[PDB]
Structure 1
């Protein structure tokens, strides 16, 4: 649909950017207000830093992935500077929130709760034949009621034929990315499952960096030996054994997100 017909199109005049939350190579991230009252998040593109089409590709994908557990597209402004406007999450990044005073006092119960909400979200993505590719605590957002939602769909893809394959020079965070995506550039929902495993260690260690004290090459070397991440401090053995299912050698042996959700819910109501 052209912008004069796209229901997600708004006049720039509806938006007032109030506080800049982030600034990077490709633009900024602002807290704003839509029509005076509705708090939103505004992602702006820095002209020339990258292609508008590439920039807008994220919003188009979000128009297809709507669910309570995924950050919602609020609107676009398709003339320079391009704006993407999304649901505003009051507590920000999960990796950050876990490190605040409020985050620090969270019981293992509530942590398992949040882990179940993330999985519930990825389960929806799972059924829709999508993948995320960038699943990690940095890309989970928390609300003012302490709920969690998947975010940043820049790399998310639709899987018609059951596999998406990237290019040669394409590089990804080694600690969070499954071996098959690192080695062959092949991604599936099972690749996400592996990331979800890493993400679980982020949750239980209040946002600590995975594979404590190991360089990327040490991590690859260890994984190939059959080793997995060492038991994090204060990690329920049940959770650790769940992480391990996520880290199974063969993608098809790794559990579904629906299984992961239901298991995390038993864990949560049990404590």
Structure 2
């Protein structure tokens, strides 16, 4: 809809940017307030750093993916500098949170709880015929109540047919991406499942980089041999085997996110 008819467009005057949470090549993300009292996250686009349409495309997709387990779109300011305002998560990125004094003290029980919460969010994405493609601990946000939500939908895509094919030149984080995606540029929800497996290792190691001591070439070589990531230190064996399911050779053999959610919830209610 046109901005003068769009429910999400808001006057820039309604926003007060208070603290910067991140600065980058394409813009910044600040902590701020909407209409004085409501805490929000404000992603601002650096003019000329990238297409405004590309930037706003994520907001448009977020309009279609509303759920308690996904960071919620709040509003947009479509006049430069362009803003996308969303729900604020008091404890930042999961990869960062797990390294703080609080994160470090979390029990395996709570880590599994968080894992299930993430799988729950992905299960929604799965059912709505969407894919995320950038599933990793850095893209999971944590609330003041230690609940987790899926973030960054820049690479997310509505899957009209079973799979999405990227651009031959497109590059992705080798360690978190499924083989078929790395080799063919083909992404499916099953590609996200593989990524979830890697994310689980990030959780249990409190933010450690996957495949410790290995370069990307080494990871690919080993994977092709049928090897998978070595059991992380102090990783419960049941969780490790759940990870293995996510890393099955055939995408179709990997479990659904609803299955993963169900199992992780059992793991949690057991501990």
Q: TM-score range, shorter-chain basis?
A: over 0.9
Alignment correspondent of 1:144? 144
Query: For residues 227-262 of structure 1, what are the alpha-carbon distances to aligned partners after superposition, in whole Å with 9 as ceiling and x for unaligned?
Result: 000000000000000000000000000000000000
Partner Cα distance (2:260, 2:105) in 1: 25
- Structure 1 residue 71, shift from structure 2 partner: 0.2
**TM-score between both structures, scaled by the size of structure 1:** 1.00
Residues 156-209 of structure 1: per-residue CA shift (max 9 Å, x gap): 000111111001110000000000000000000000000000000000000000
Report the RMSD for the aligned CA atoms in angstroms: 0.3
- How far did 1:77 drift? 0.2
Aligned residues: 271
Q: Which runs of 5+ in 2 are unaligned?
A: none
CA distance in 1, matches of 2:167, 2:69: 30
* Distance (Å, rounded) in 2 between the aligned partners of 1:2 and 1:26: 25
Q: CA deviation at 1:121?
A: 0.3
**Equivalence for 1:154:** 154
Could you list the structure 1 runs, at least 4 aligned residues long, displaced by more than 6 angstroms after superposition. none
How far does the alpha carbon of each residue in 1:10-67 deviate from its partner, in whole angstroms, 9 at most, with x for none? 0000000000111100000000000000000000000000000000000000000000
Q: Once the two structures are superposed, what CA deviation does each residue of 1:53-96 show, in whole Å capped at 9, x if it has no partner?
A: 00000000000000000000000000000000011000000000
C-alpha distance in 1 between matches for 2:99 and 2:217 = 28
Q: Distance in 2 between matches of 1:50 and 1:18?
A: 25
In the aligned structure 1, how far is the partner of 2:163 from the partner of 2:97? 34
